[PDB]
Design a protein around this nucleic acid. Structure first.
Lengths: 229, 329, 51, 129, 25, 30, 106, 213
RNA sequence: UUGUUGAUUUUGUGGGUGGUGGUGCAUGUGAUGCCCGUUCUGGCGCGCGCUACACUGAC
């Protein structure tokens, strides 16, 4: 009975941005990212490629792995939820970088070219497109809370926390609010990086989960919950 | 001739055989044009034999054959422009069959099939079909195009248009079919026709040159048999089968009512009823388009990031100028 | 789109409303009740809007 | 006409909704009347254009491609008819001869012993010499 | 008549996927 | 191999492996 | 029941001088997109063609567009005014030599 | 228990990373890469586009680290584009860094097996079918195929059976690598998916379907 | 046809070949398993001041 829309042509959904706070979205915060540069040319410090220099710098090479941050972005950006324009990514680096990752960005899949980009993002504080039409990666002012939408639910990944079904969780949450999941890209550490912002912590599987596996498990549940398909 | 001029014997024999491939095809078509009712058996022993030789030649000289085939299509079209059906002969009907033998009919595009299949469709519609000769000619044409789409099963509206007028031509109008344009009203078949004797439905090509009631019935049966097959193969799959078969169903109903003994339309009508029963005619749904993703843009960056000459010249001046003042002081 | 303007002030748009994607051929203020504005569209639904 | 959204099958559609969709399909009847002379009473809007869908299988490839446009999004604002009105069988044949792209002829691997039926394998059954 | 309106209509007339990597250089 | 080639040619594969859509550029305009 | 506008419907897009111009944009600033056509030049063209600048590009009729094209292709004929339409390396070497001698003195 | 090709009775989710681009090149023998070795692959004449073993690496990470493997309901097969079939023991913890991962593959391809002091990685004889369970469902990932539900698909599927998913590790190519073995082709989502994302999607459903949690 | 030479080649049509290929295995051998060159020519740090990113604006 209802009249059909004037144009049935498929149109790309709007690209979500921090400026817009009303729209519901999955915000994923890759906290405790090990993303640091140093002259040798500036090269992204790595746990394995650059051992001695970090020893000279005095930090533990165990927490010197930008690979984990890279894999999480790959699965997050390539997830269908991103293709539906319902997910935006933030990265909280260990020294205190807050990085806004535009959903439209297409990071290089090979880690070497990923590292090549990151040193530039840290120095220029932003990244532009090849066609020079939009800024894909931008460094932004802390705290993350102001960037986060006005009505939102905040959680983290805690292995000690009770095991919850992500699909059941999202369904019970409200439709105007939005969901923030704080994922610790660190290989090992205490789960209190985002405690000051969040109010509760949840578990997904009784077995341990990698950051790339856990965030993928999150988005897949929401797509089932929101029928993103 | 082929043995005497094999490729290995001398240089250029490939070209000579390639031209001979074109020459042979015209000979095959030429003989069919000539009268052969006297010695049909002997003509059958040469007509098929030459085609087999042409098949071997086409395997090596398809390009030469294709060029000659296209020329014949152009030539006949020009003859149809001036002579219409008088241009059309038995050799044309023979000519088209050979392409089906020597070329792949089941292609969306082909050099020789598509010009030809355009050209059969023109005959199936443009020609008046006001004589038993002309109707018999169309019956052969419908069979050729049907064999062309034997696997492809593409839809040819001219076949639908052809069947409607021919079926109505032999029942002339009943005053119920005013949407069908007839070109002859004196071909109405008499009521006394038995429709229980076993009449051959095969239409010889030589009998055309000769061209009564039995002949009219035989042409009707061959056309009508082609109708039943086309419903079974092509139209059954098409989404608009009910719309396509609706005029045909009414015409076939008239055949049964006027001729109760006459069985095949009842078989077709019963057969048509079964298809309409099983087929679920639901509204089509084609404007479902897959949702389009958000755009993706590659990042712009230097592989080895660094943390014209006049500017370089100016830069050097500042350093030298700085030193000199500290030198003067 | 239905747009409301101050008479004799073409610069400033007071209220801009998207009645529907289809054309909105009719837009009239209600004579008795000033606040409410009626819009009819090719969507065949005559939405009654208020300022 | 080109699409009634009510009869789409969505994977998220619940089993009771699936049952309802089945009943709707069973009870549908085309309401378009061909004999009504008043075009406002033919009930055309409630029908669908199955005829155009069949034309996508039209033997001419270009005609099929043109018919296929209804299956594609309506991005184009309009079509210039003066490029489409005055086409004849002769023009179609002439265009086919004057083709920008030339292809290699293909052959038939299947073999027929006799082209025409008698009065092993017959290419054209029902016709004889 | 075609030529007349043939003139008028002249003025009327007017993605990385799956696993594709960004162009190398 | 031959049967697979026939099916491809049926679906719109042209051996100059171009497609039918490639042919339909500029035919109608002229 | 039958109404046909003689002027025609609005044109969302138009093709002028082998350039696509949005009908939504106005005649002056829709024509600016054409290579070699700026704001002042487009304004002069619109004045010479006697086309109201306050109109949108879609509104332009066939005769107005053809006249505008004639203005572009024949400016002089309609009286468009004409006015409207190693050593550095050597100096581098000299500076370099001066620098080397400055080092030599020091 | 650690599932193995020898045992066929147990229900398990098999996944085949078909057309895996793992190749060793001696100038020393190192895994060929799209970026690291461009001119060298040009000398071999193979296209550098189909020279990304990173794809195979990433799929294994999300796959091996998935909860379903931790529950012992998963075994992985890799079919190299060259024609080499590799059995991945579920217990293996492949290196997270790729450069190390490349070092293992060159060891595997030349030694034909990796042992730790059961072989964690083993080269096994083709065809793939004989290794598979006797009663098993075979599917692939197709963009053109109808979109289905991994959860609903597994639920309506039987219990004594096992499920095979032949995931294409290629960056680009025709989706006919596993046509000979597989009986039907299915789509997971309307939108495009990377090989890592799709197997992550499929394993998540098995966890939901089988209540692995 | 060679570079004078004498049928060694040349031309046209068909046409089999992965092979001075590696690598391991079994007391060198195996219808072994597995896959798949030549010569030169070049090679900034610390700091000031001003203008912009528009509708409180542009013309």
């Amino acid at each position: 009975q209802k009249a059909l829309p004037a144009s049935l042509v498929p149109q790309a959904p709007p690209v979500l941005t921090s400026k817009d706070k009303i729209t519901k979205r999955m915000i994923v915060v890759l906290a405790m990212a090990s993303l640091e540069t140093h002259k040798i040319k500036y090269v992204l410090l790595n746990c394995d490629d650059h051992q001695g220099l970090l020893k000279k710098m005095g930090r533990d090479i165990s927490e010197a792995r930008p690979d984990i941050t890279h894999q999480c972005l790959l699965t997050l950006l390539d997830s269908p939820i991103n293709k539906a324009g319902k997910l935006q990514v933030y990265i909280q680096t260990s020294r205190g970088i807050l990085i806004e990752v535009n959903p439209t960005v297409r990071i290089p899949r090979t880690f070497k070219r990923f590292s090549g980009l990151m040193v530039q993002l840290l120095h220029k504080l932003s990244i532009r497109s090849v066609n020079s039409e939009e800024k894909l990666l931008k460094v932004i002012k802390n705290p993350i809370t102001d960037h986060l939408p006005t009505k939102c639910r905040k959680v983290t990944l805690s292995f000690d926390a009770p095991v919850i079904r992500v699909q059941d969780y999202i369904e019970k949450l409200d439709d105007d609010e939005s969901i923030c999941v704080f994922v610790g890209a660190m290989a090992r550490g205490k789960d209190n990086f985002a405690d000051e912002y969040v109010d509760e912590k949840v578990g997904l599987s009784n077995y341990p989960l990698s950051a790339s596996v856990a965030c993928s498990k999150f988005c897949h549940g929401a797509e089932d919950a929101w029928n993103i398909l | 001739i082929i043995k005497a001029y094999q490729p290995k014997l001398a240089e250029g024999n490939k070209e000579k055989l390639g031209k001979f491939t074109a020459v042979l095809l015209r000979h095959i078509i030429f003989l069919s044009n000539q009268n052969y009712l006297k010695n049909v058996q002997s003509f059958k022993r040469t007509q098929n034999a030459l085609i087999s030789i042409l098949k071997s030649l086409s395997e090596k000289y398809n390009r030469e054959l294709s060029e000659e085939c296209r020329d014949y299509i152009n030539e006949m079209q020009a003859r149809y422009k001036k002579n219409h059906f008088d241009a059309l002969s038995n050799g044309d009907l023979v000519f088209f069959s050979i392409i089906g033998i020597l070329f792949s009919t089941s292609d969306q595009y082909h050099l020789v099939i598509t010009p030809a299949l355009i050209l059969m469709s023109q005959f199936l519609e443009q020609i008046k079909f006001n004589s038993l000769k002309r109707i018999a000619f169309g019956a052969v044409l419908v069979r050729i195009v049907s064999q062309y789409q034997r696997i492809s099963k593409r839809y040819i509206p001219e076949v639908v248009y052809f069947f409607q007028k021919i079926l109505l031509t032999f029942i002339v109008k009943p005053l119920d079919f005013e949407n069908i344009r007839l070109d002859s009203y004196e071909l109405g078949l008499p009521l006394d026709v038995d429709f229980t004797k076993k009449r051959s439905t095969i239409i010889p090509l030589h009998t055309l040159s000769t061209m009564p009631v039995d002949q009219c019935v035989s042409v009707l049966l061959n056309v009508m048999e082609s109708l039943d097959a086309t419903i079974s193969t092509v139209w059954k799959s098409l989404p608009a089968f009910n719309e396509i078969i609706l005029p045909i169903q009414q015409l076939l109903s008239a055949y049964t009512s006027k001729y109760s003994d006459f069985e095949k339309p009842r078989n077709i009508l019963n057969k048509v009823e079964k298809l309409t029963k099983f087929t679920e005619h639901i509204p089509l749904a084609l404007q479902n388009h897959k949702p389009v993703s958000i755009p993706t843009h590659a990042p712009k960056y230097e592989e080895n990031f660094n943390p014209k000459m006049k500017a370089q010249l100016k830069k050097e001046r500042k350093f030298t100028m700085k030193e000199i003042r500290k030198d003067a002081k | 789109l239905v747009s409301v303007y101050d008479s004799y002030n073409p610069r400033t748009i007071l209220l801009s409303i998207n009645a529907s994607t289809h054309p909105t051929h009719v837009t009239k203020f209600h004579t008795q009740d000033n606040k409410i504005l009626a819009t009819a569209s090719d969507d065949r639904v005559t939405r009654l809007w208020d300022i | 006409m080109l699409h009634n959204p009510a009869f789409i099958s969505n994977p998220f559609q619940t089993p009771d909704q699936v049952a309802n969709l089945k009943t709707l399909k069973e009870n549908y009847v085309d309401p378009f009347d061909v004999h009504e002379s008043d075009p406002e009473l033919t009930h055309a809007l409630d029908s669908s254009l199955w005829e155009l869908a069949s034309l996508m299988e039209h033997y001419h490839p270009n005609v099929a491609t043109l018919a296929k446009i209804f299956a594609q999004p309506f991005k184009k604002l309009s079509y210039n008819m003066e490029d489409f009105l005055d086409w004849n069988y002769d023009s179609l044949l002439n265009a086919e001869s004057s083709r920008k792209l030339k292809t290699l002829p293909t052959l038939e691997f299947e073999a027929f012993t006799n082209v025409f039926d008698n009065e092993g394998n017959v290419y054209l059954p029902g016709v004889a010499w | 008549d075609k030529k007349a309106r043939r003139r008028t209509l002249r003025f009327y007339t007017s993605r990385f996927k799956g696993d594709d990597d960004i162009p190398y250089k | 191999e031959l049967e697979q080639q026939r099916l491809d040619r049926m679906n719109g594969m042209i051996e100059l492996e171009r497609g039918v859509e490639d042919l339909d550029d500029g035919f109608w305009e002229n | 029941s039958l109404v046909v506008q003689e002027q025609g419907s609005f044109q969302h897009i138009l093709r002028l001088l082998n350039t696509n111009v949005d009908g939504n944009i106005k005649i002056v600033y829709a024509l600016t997109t054409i290579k070699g056509v700026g704001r002042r030049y487009s304004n002069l063209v619109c004045k010479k063609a006697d086309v109201d600048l306050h109109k949108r590009a879609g509104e332009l009729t066939q005769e107005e567009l053809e006249r505008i094209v004639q203005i572009m292709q024949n400016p002089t004929h309609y009286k468009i005014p004409a006015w409207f339409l190693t050593l550095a390396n050597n100096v581098e070497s000299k500076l370099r030599d001066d620098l080397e001698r400055l080092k030599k003195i020091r």
